[PDB]
Ligand binder design. Structure first.
Ligand SMILES: C[C@H](CCC(=O)NCCC[N+](C)(C)C[C@H](O)CS(=O)(=O)O)[C@H]1CC[C@H]2[C@@H]3[C@H](O)C[C@@H]4C[C@H](O)CC[C@]4(C)[C@H]3C[C@H](O)[C@]12C
Ligand SMILES: C[C@H](CCC(=O)NCCC[N+](C)(C)C[C@H](O)CS(=O)(=O)O)[C@H]1CC[C@H]2[C@@H]3[C@H](O)C[C@@H]4C[C@H](O)CC[C@]4(C)[C@H]3C[C@H](O)[C@]12C
Ligand SMILES: [Mg+2]
Lengths: 69, 101, 1340, 153, 251
DNA sequence: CTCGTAGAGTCCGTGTCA
């Protein structure tokens, strides 16, 4: 169900955005979980370019420069 | 209520008949003033789950597909084929009702 | 008719005769607070009640008590107006005489000392104004009456949700006025549990055990016993014949020789009848039948003492056999018929672990405060004070009345504390309903909902203050020594006044008086809220209470309620409604004597109303209260139907009684949908007073009632002749009949001129009457804001045409012709206040001088040397009003600027500018200035000038009044002196004071001259002392807030003209924005050449089923047609005859009308006056439901010589060609709403930011930007618009470094960006890192 | 229980009852360890003395957010007694001039003390009938250099 | 911060921290004094209570604030919940260069433009105006430009017209149900304080001319301008994103 | 087949939205 499905997202900032914040924060803290942001809502949160639409190319371009020599 | 309101707005209603319609309208107003909050919550959840979906690839190249028919709910064809299929990409070649077409 | 009535009569439609006229509309507030003050001996409602409740305060067993005498209301130190100006609370000091009495211990009983305190001061209490308001800090606040649930006992159902298997579980709630609540609820397994108000669930029987009741005593008090006697052998049952009713028999029931009930066939009614008439008493019974019964008492082995059967034990063969060999003849079982009499208390006893009283008190004590070691005495005192201590637990006279009514006991008045019988009866009723021989009550019945007005809540808060001080005084009276101190040091007044002023100031139900329209005031005072303390919260409830109950008929208005989130919890009070003696809601009805419908009225509450068959007002009555139809329409138990002529007990007082005043004003209500009625009423109450109010062409008759009842009009107290009229005061010469014997004199009314209303609107009173006009008691002297000739004129009536005009009225938008603004008929005046405060900074006090660094002399031109605007100067946005400078040094300027200072020699001014300049975009006249200096500081010259002006003005006014009253007094002395020998020829040439010194025959006449002489002297001396007092009030330094040196207040008067974007509405809920102002010629015009004023979109009528506005337009067109016809007939100056005949023919207009007009009045001139007033259009009056029929409109239109269909052919002003299909034109009364575009318009480029999160402030005073909410973020994401979102999210609001980068780039003409990190995200990082969680930005 | 009995006196000076009882326990222990039966002094008085000496000291120091000299607190107490007496006798209230009369202080310190006594308001106090914004939502940051001025510079 | 009027405003964390530090110092001294076990137990209990209220007040006895009965706000309260943070202040900001006002019809407009009040135009585009004023040299420096704008001379209107010519604006109505709740238009200067909206699109906005208000934002950077002009210009969205049918149908 | 243990269902109280 859409709430639970939302709950099972990879990024913990996404889950923290709208659910019981304490729950997700404690889970992520104990798990040592690592959020690469990878998504739309996180990118909004940090105030960088969305990977959607006009900004998709940017991130795609970044991907070639990212994780390379 | 068993007895209805016999008069209409061109003519004039009477005390009790008004009273009744008053109740009707009051309930209606509250109804809306709550359908707005519920619809807002629902749509927020919906956009929440569906945030990340972006068209990333040009063509996945699968042979899979779903069989679309005209929804003939019981008595008749409530919604035809054409509107349900307009603007969708095809999964495979369609034949006339007669093979090799 | 009265003289105000003769001035301008209003044509009335309406068929049924008003038996009762509308009462004084504000009665509730005034009379309730009157009851609150009300010095009375008998302890009834009144401060007295609170005192007698709390006092006498007895020492901690010290036998030195404090006793109460009486209270006295001090006279307010500050009159109303000055209290408003100076920002103080308008109040009276309260003084109380007390006696401290001290006994001796141990004395042969005798009070050693009684000493009386010199009227100790117990704080200040705000007083209510004549209109029913309170001035709390120089602002009028209103305390809206509050509806809430009455104390008592209520049985709720709570169906459905109980486990989703039905299980309709009832519960009894006992609610006190003051104290904890009791709740009895069931469980799935039918066990009765008690809970304390909002606590855990206890087994109910414990309370009965806590009441010191034994188990067997309990089951005795509840269940109906069955005796099993031993008669010659084996355990046979004594039988109640009806007892088996509806019970299958387990054995063969023969008795005394005859088989009655067959073995196996369930006992039928026939066999029961057999036994009943045969009178069979006793039956032998199989022991198996007994194997199922229950044991009532604890039958021990009485011979030896060993117990056999225990309390609440099932009966088994072994127990009965043990008893029979033991020899016990009488066994007492219970009657448990699972259908009627259920095992409820039995099952509680089975689950009941507690047995003794002590164990129950232990459980209570350890449950209420879990964990504290239970002490026997501690628990006993706890419980006793919980429910039987007079102080904590009091229901009421009301609570008790409802309680006893619910349990149907003849006694109305009971004891405050709950006697145990009460609880027992409550549980009896609960189990009775649980069996099904009783109905549950619905909370939403008005008979269960009580109205608490001001006086009661004030009394409660005062009670609380007293209980605080009482404990305090006990502390001081028990420990400290008794006999040295007098009884004023013991009690501290601070907390009492603290609590009362806290309530009056900071409460939800004490709100700003909505003061822009008289209707606004009247309806806001007559409001009923379910919110506040002791009441509901908006989130909890809940549709039950919002819906309209059939009980509201004629008591609360069904149609007026805010459409916002709080729908239903405001619900303004109906017109005729009153409060009962007990605080309930009651409405009048006309009595019905079987055949005749009499004129005696009785006020009924809801519960009594339920019983009778009441006929509706809309019933046809012939000449003596006889019904024309044998079959009439009534309602008795909330259901309407037809009943016969000889059954109706009462009848509606008048048709209007269903609706509130606001709704009562809307014409042709009968034809409008409820929704648009609601919106119409709400909007109509917000109309802003225009410059020239005129009158509604189509009213409802309430206009005069509201106008008089609002306090803004000036009304005559003693009728007479207008002696002097000036645009500030009306001086009236009393009629000799109405002259008080001792010192009647003349009456002087000072009017109020433009002062600022709560919403910044003007409230000005203009004189109505002219010199020499005779006035009667209760006549309307002066029209207040938005009032005409005594009538309510909220807005103005203009010529509208329904048609689409180049989509400029596309949606509900409205077109307006330049003609209206040309005549300036919708121009409002707004009086704004501005404040400059000079505080003390740590670098030094601020300064008010006019010397302001680097200011152009252009702006300073308009200030005097002191730095204050001249009264009457015209200012605009940006101009400087009051100069103010602040100390500021040690700038530590940047190097390059230092270089600049060295270069040019620019001595840096150590004072920054702070002057209070005019807000942007407002331009008007400054009408007045006020200056407040704290005591001690050196008054500036301008303050002295203002004090000189005020002094001289007050002196002038006092001399004015004294001289006018003295002239009247001397005139009366002359009027008496003509009796007993006329001497006025001698008199008129000798001085005036040589009229008292003259003599007359020693009689009552000379005594009356003596009276008038003594009154002359007394008026003189009072004049002198009040004058001196006024100068002392003027001079005294005013008390200012800590830290503020002085203050300058300025009242600005802005003239706001109607302009595009403003909101206008009709009374029927049609709304609109004025979209374009066109030249006169562009407007459509009729053949005759008169252009229309407004062009309204027709498409708004059919979809929004408010059709009444159309009939209104027709009838108004007819009225204005009459008006034009008479104006034409007047301009030709025909003759009295012609006008009189025509005006009579008009007033008659058919029949069935209750008007009853001339020819009685004076024959020529006053008719000319009436024509002069009516030439602007003859006013029609349809009451709400007994209104004007269509045919009557047609007929009146025919009288005007106008198309009967109400449509005219119209010519297009642009092209000149005619419109096809002629259109409806006519006058509608439209309103200008308070939403003025100039207030709403708002923009910011850059401005102030917030402290913690560097985001721009939200709001209007500080510039403030719009809130880009998440929904908009989603909107942006729907498009591929990433860059806009990015800038919006960081450079536009939160990134400081980025925002400055952006400003510089923009100014330089480059468009790039520098995203940075949003500050709020940094805040989040720091905040969670402040927690014990490590949050790091990784990198790869 | 003695500590509890004396503690209930100080019950409205911004201090969690339990902190009060704790300070009293510290004072009582101090008295006991310092108690002298051979010096000639009533034991109970000695104890209660130390109890108060500790409790009042703690409330004076750590009660207010901004710590304030104790003599200043005594000044406030005197002011409050005087205000109470004069107000309840006179009925109206004593004006700062009248207070300056009643005590010999030059009244400049009277209003200074009145200014100091004001407690800080909670930044979240909800604004009237609009429980959406608190007070914190209004306070503006004056530190910020104006962008105009940066461009000028 | 010291608010004007000698009184002070503080966050609740000040009180919470003060209380915790007090209890810490008291426990330190108690250990130095070797108090009996009961007292050290009580001190540790209270310290635990203070800490847990500090982290998350609301899972225990609700440590109220000084004399105000309102429970004081703990860290989690600042983070968690809608009213507090993440939801409230980080997707619900308050942008600059924005305006708001009442809407009015004004039928004569072209589909792709909207009537905008002058005075708002100056207020919004202040910095653009300054830039152009300084570029053409009509104003020696920025300060003189500011004075020249507050005088409101004809040259100011000329430059404002030239800047407004091709620059696009975003117009929004508060309940943005679907993506068409925010759309781009070219502004046309008009007198008065009311915003004029093209009628055909009111249906798309679900707007009514009965006192409904609309907000107006200005895209600043050049890329934003192009995004607006390409994707968000009214003329580009005639078909509903929900179903393919036209939205701008006559009403 | 019953005792001891295992499983399923339910209830209460808390957390969660406006
Ligand atoms: C004075 C009045 C008695 C009513 C009465 O019986 N009048 C006598 C009227 C009798 N008559 C004239 C109408 C003739 C009747 O026919 C005789 S009979 O009633 O039918 O026997 C009692 C009944 C309800 C009581 C109020 C409520 O508790 C709320 C509140 C409680 C506070 O703590 C104190 C204040 C409040 C406002 C109370 C005031 C006062 O205490 C009331 C009005
Ligand atoms: C009572 C007095 C009428 C006096 C009168 O009528 N005397 C008649 C005296 C007749 N006698 C006694 C001399 C005998 C004559 O012989 C009678 S006869 O002529 O022979 O028939 C009324 C009528 C007009 C009123 C004045 C106006 O407000 C303006 C005036 C200026 C102030 O800014 C406002 C108040 C002032 C002071 C008012 C004074 C006073 O309130 C006046 C005069
Ligand atoms: Mg609208």
């Amino acid at each position: 169900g859409i709430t639970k499905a939302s709950l099972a997202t990879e990024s913990f900032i996404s889950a923290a955005s709208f659910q019981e914040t304490t729950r997700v924060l404690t889970e992520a803290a104990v798990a040592g979980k690592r959020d690469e942001l990878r998504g739309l809502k996180e990118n909004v949160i940090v105030g960088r370019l969305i990977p959607a639409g006009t900004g998709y190319a940017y991130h795609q371009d970044r991907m070639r420069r990212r994780a390379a020599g | 209520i068993e007895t209805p309101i016999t008069a209409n707005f061109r003519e004039g209603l009477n005390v009790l008949q008004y009273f009744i319609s008053t109740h009707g309208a009051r309930k209606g107003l509250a109804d809306t003033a709550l359908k707005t909050a519920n619809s807002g919550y629902l749509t927020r959840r919906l956009v929440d789950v569906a945030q990340d979906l972006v068209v990333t690839e040009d063509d996945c190249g699968t042979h899979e597909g779903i069989m679309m028919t005209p929804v003939i709910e019981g008595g008749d064809v409530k919604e035809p084929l054409r509107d349900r299929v307009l603007g969708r990409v095809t999964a495979e070649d369609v034949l006339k009702p007669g093979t090799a077409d | 008719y009265s003289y105000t009535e003769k001035k301008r009569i209003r044509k009335d439609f309406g068929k049924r005769p008003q038996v009762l006229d509308v009462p004084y509309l504000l009665s509730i507030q005034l009379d309730s607070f009157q009851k609150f003050i009300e010095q009375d001996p008998e302890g009834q409602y009144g401060l007295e009640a609170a005192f007698r409740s709390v006092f006498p305060i007895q020492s901690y067993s010290g036998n030195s008590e404090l006793q109460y005498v009486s209270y006295r209301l001090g006279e307010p130190v500050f009159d109303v107006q000055e209290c408003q100006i100076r920002g103080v609370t308008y109040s009276a000091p309260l003084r109380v005489k007390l006696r401290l009495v001290i006994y001796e211990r141990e004395a042969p009983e005798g009070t050693v000392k009684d000493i009386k305190e010199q009227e100790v001061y117990m704080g200040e209490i705000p007083l209510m104004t004549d209109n029913g308001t309170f001035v709390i800090n120089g602002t009028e606040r209103v305390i809206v009456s509050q509806l809430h649930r009455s104390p008592g006992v209520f049985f709720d159902s709570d169906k459905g949700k109980t486990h989703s298997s039905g299980k309709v579980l009832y519960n009894a709630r006992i609610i006190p006025y003051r104290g904890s609540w009791l709740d009895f609820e069931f469980d799935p397994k039918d066990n009765l549990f008690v809970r304390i108000d909002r606590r855990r669930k206890l087994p109910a029987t414990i309370i009965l055990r806590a009441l010191n009741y034994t188990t067997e005593q309990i089951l005795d008090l509840f269940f109906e016993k069955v005796i099993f006697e031993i008669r010659d052998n084996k355990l046979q049952m004594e039988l109640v014949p009806e007892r088996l009713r509806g019970e299958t028999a387990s054995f063969d029931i023969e008795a005394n020789g005859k088989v009655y009930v067959e073995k196996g066939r369930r006992i039928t009614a026939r066999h029961i009848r057999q036994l009943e008439k045969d009178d069979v008493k006793l039956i032998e019974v199989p022991v198996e039948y007994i194997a199922g019964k229950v044991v009532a008492k604890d039958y021990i082995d009485e011979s030896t003492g060993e117990l056999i059967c225990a309390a609440n034990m099932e009966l088994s063969l072994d127990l009965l056999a043990k008893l029979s060999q033991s020899g016990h003849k009488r066994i007492e079982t219970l009657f448990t018929n699972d259908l009627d009499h259920g095992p409820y208390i039995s099952e509680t006893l089975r689950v009941d672990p507690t047995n003794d009283r002590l164990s129950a008190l232990v459980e209570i004590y350890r449950m209420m405060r879990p964990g504290e070691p239970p002490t026997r005495e501690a628990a006993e005192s706890l419980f006793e004070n919980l429910f039987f201590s007079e102080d904590r637990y009091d229901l009421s006279a009301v609570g008790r009345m409802k309680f006893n009514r619910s349990l149907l006991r003849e006694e109305i008045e009971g004891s405050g504390i709950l006697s145990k019988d009460d609880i027992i009866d409550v549980m009896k009723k609960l189990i009775d309903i649980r069996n099904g021989k009783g109905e549950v009550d619905d909370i939403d019945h008005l008979g269960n909902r009580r109205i608490r007005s001001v006086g009661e809540m004030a009394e409660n808060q005062f009670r609380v203050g007293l209980v605080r001080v009482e404990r305090a005084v006990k502390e001081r009276l028990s420990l400290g020594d008794l006999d040295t101190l007098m009884p004023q040091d013991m009690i501290n007044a601070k907390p009492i006044s603290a609590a009362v002023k806290e309530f009056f100031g900071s409460s939800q139900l004490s709100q700003f008086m909505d003061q822009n329209n008289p209707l606004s005031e009247i309806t806001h005072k007559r409001r009923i809220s379910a919110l506040g303390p002791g009441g509901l919260t908006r989130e909890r409830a809940g549709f039950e209470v919002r819906d309209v109950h059939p009980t509201h008929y004629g008591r609360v208005c069904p149609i007026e309620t805010p459409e916002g989130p709080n729908i239903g919890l405001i619900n303004s009070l109906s017109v005729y409604a009153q409060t009962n003696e007990y605080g309930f809601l009651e409405t009048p009805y006309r009595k019905v004597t079987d055949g005749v419908v009499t004129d005696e009225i009785h006020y009924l509450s809801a519960i009594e109303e339920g019983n009778y068959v009441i006929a509706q007002a809309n019933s046809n009555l012939d000449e003596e209260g006889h019904f024309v139809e044998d079959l009439v329409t009534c309602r008795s138990k909330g259901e309407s139907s037809l009943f016969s002529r000889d059954q109706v007990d009462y009848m509606d007082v008048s048709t209007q009684q269903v609706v509130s005043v606001g709704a009562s004003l809307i014409p042709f209500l009968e034809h409008d949908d409820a929704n648009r009625a609601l919106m119409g009423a709400n909007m109509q109450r917000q109309a802003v007073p225009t410059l020239r109010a005129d009158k509604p062409l189509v009213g409802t008759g309430m206009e005069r009632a509201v106008a008089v009842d609002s306090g803004v009009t000036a009304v005559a107290k003693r009728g007479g002749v207008v002696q002097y009229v000036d645009a500030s005061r009306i001086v009236i010469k009393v009629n000799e009949d109405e002259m008080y014997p001792g010192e009647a004199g003349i009456d002087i009314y000072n009017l109020t001129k433009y002062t600022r209303s709560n919403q910044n609107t003007c409230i000005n009173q203009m004189p109505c009457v002219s010199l020499g006009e005779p006035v009667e008691r209760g006549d309307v002297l002066a029209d207040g804001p938005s009032t005409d000739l005594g009538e309510l004129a909220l807005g103005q009536n203009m010529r509208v045409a329904f048609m689409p005009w180049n989509g400029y009225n596309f949606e509900d938008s409205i077109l307006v012709s330049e003609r209206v603004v040309q005549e300036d008929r919708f121009t409002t005046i707004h009086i704004q206040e501005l404040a400059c405060v000079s505080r003390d900074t740590k670098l030094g006090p601020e300064e008010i001088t006019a010397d302001i660094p680097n200011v152009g002399e252009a702006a300073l031109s308009k200030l005097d040397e002191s730095g204050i605007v001249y009264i009457g100067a015209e200012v605009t946005g940006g101009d400087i009003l009051v100069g103010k400078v602040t100390p500021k040094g040690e700038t530590q300027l940047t190097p390059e600027e230092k270089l600049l200072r060295a270069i040019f020699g620019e001595k840096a001014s150590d004072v920054k500018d702070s002057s209070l300049r005019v807000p942007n975009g407002v331009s008007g006249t400054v009408i007045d200035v006020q200056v407040f200096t704290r005591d001690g500081v050196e008054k500036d010259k301008r303050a002295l000038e203002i004090e000189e002006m005020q002094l001289k003005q007050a002196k002038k006014d006092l001399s004015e009044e004294l001289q006018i009253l003295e002239a009247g007094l001397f005139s009366r002395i002359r009027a008496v002196l003509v009796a007993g020998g006329v001497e006025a020829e001698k008199l008129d040439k000798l001085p005036r004071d040589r009229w008292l010194e003259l003599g007359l025959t020693d009689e009552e006449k000379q005594n009356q001259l003596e009276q008038l002489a003594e009154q002359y002297d007394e008026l003189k001396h009072e004049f002198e002392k009040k004058l001196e007092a006024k100068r002392r009030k003027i001079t005294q330094g005013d008390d200012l807030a800590p830290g503020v040196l002085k203050i300058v207040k300025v009242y600005l008067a802005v003239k706001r003209r109607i302009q595009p974007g403003d909101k206008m509405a009709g009374r029927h809920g049609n709304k609109g924005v004025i979209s374009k102002i066109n030249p006169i010629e562009d407007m459509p015009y009729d053949e005759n050449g008169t252009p229309v004023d407004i062009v309204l979109n027709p498409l708004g009528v059919p979809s929004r089923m408010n059709i009444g506005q159309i009939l209104e337009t027709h009838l108004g067109m007819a009225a204005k047609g009459i008006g034009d016809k008479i104006n034409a007939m007047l301009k030709q100056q025909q003759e009295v005859a012609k006008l009189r005949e025509f005006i009579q023919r008009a007033y008659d207009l058919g029949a069935d009308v209750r008007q009853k007009v001339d020819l009685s009045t004076f024959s020529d001139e006053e008719v000319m006056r009436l024509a002069e007033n009516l030439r602007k259009g003859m006013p029609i009056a349809t009451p709400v439901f007994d209104g004007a029929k269509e045919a009557e409109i047609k007929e009146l239109l025919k009288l005007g010589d106008l198309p009967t269909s109400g449509q005219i052919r119209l010519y297009d002003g642009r092209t000149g060609e005619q419109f096809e299909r002629p259109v409806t034109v006519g006058y509608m009364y439209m309103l200008k709403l308070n939403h003025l575009v100039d207030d709403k318009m708002h923009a910011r480029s850059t401005g102030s930011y917030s402290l913690v999160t560097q985001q721009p402030l939200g709001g209007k005073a500080q510039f403030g930007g719009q809130r880009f909410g998440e929904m908009e973020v989603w909107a942006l994401e729907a498009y591929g618009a990433a860059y806009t979102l990015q800038e919006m999210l960081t450079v536009k609001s939160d990134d400081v470094n980025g925002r400055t980068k952006m400003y510089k780039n923009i100014v330089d003409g480059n468009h790039q960006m520098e995203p940075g990190m949003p500050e709020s995200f940094n805040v989040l990082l720091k905040e969670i890192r402040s927690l014990g969680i490590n949050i790091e930005l990784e990198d790869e | 229980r003695l500590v509890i009995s004396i503690a209930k006196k100080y019950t409205n000076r911004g201090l969690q009852f339990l902190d009060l009882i704790q300070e009293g326990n510290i004072g009582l222990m101090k008295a006991v360890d310092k108690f002298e039966y051979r010096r000639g002094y009533k034991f109970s008085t000695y104890a209660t003395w130390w109890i108060r000496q500790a409790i009042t000291r703690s409330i004076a120091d750590q009660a207010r957010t901004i710590r304030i000299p104790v003599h200043m607190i005594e000044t406030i107490n005197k002011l409050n007694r005087i205000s109470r007496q004069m107000l309840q006798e006179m009925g109206r209230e004593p004006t700062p001039e009248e207070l300056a009369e009643r005590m010999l202080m030059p009244e400049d310190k009277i209003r200074k003390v009145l200014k100091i006594a004001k407690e800080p308001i909670s930044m979240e106090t909800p604004i009237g009938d609009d429980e959406d914004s608190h007070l914190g939502d209004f306070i503006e940051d004056t530190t910020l250099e104006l962008p105009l001025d940066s461009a000028t510079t | 911060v010291p608010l004007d009027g000698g009184r002070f405003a503080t966050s609740d964390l000040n009180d919470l921290y003060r209380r915790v530090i007090n209890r810490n110092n008291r426990l330190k001294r108690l250990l130095d004094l070797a108090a009996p076990d009961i007292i050290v137990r009580n001190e540790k209990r209270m310290l635990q209570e203070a800490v847990d209220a500090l982290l998350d007040n609301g899972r225990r006895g609700r440590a109220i604030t000084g004399s105000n009965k309102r429970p004081l706000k703990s860290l989690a309260d600042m983070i968690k919940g809608k009213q507090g943070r993440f939801r409230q202040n980080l997707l619900g900001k308050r942008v600059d260069y924005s305006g708001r006002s009442v809407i009015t019809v004004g039928p004569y407009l072209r589909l792709h433009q909207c009537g905008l009040p002058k005075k708002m135009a100056l207020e919004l585009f202040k910095p653009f105006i300054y830039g152009k004023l300084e570029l053409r040299g009509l104003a020696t420096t920025i300060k003189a430009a500011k004075k020249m704008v507050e005088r409101e001379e004809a040259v100011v209107w000329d430059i404002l017209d030239e800047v407004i010519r091709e620059h696009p604006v975003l117009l929004n109505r508060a309940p943005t149900l679907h993506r068409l709740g925010i759309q781009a238009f070219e502004p046309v200067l008009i007198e008065g304080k009311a915003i004029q909206l093209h009628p055909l699109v009111c249906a798309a906005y679900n707007a009514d001319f009965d006192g409904d208000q609309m907000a107006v934002h200005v895209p600043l950077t050049l890329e934003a301008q192009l995004e607006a002009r390409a994707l968000m210009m009214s003329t580009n969205n005639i078909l509903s994103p929900a179903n393919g049918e036209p939205i701008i149908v006559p009403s």
